[PDB]
Amino acid sequence: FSIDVLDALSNYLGFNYEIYVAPDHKYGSPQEDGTWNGLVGELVFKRADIGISALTITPDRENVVDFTTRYMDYSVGVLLRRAEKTVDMFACLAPFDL
């Protein structure tokens, strides 16, 4: 989806690009020394020109990097395993093992 949006920009403005995954694999937080790990770190040390992913805007991030207008709204959720409780022809006989 974000590659789709970035191509819908590139084809309109002529951006060439190359993409590389952030090594630390985390979006990142401030550390104890005030330096930033992760994807924000790459933009703070000017190692890359733009970041693009599910990167939610928050004031403590926005303080050190600049965000466009938001293109989709955020929401927290939960994943849970499906249960059982089913009915079958063998339910007539279920009290005893086959």
Binding site: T56, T68, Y74, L80
Partner: peptide
């Protein structure tokens, strides 16, 4: 075999981060 449940939230949303002071904003 999974199921999932959402929640209604607003204000915050996904964006594109530019380097500080970069002109393309």
């Amino acid at each position: 075999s999974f199921y999932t449940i959402g929640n209604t939230v607003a204000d915050r949303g996904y964006g594109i981060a530019l380097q500080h002071g970069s002109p393309y904003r």
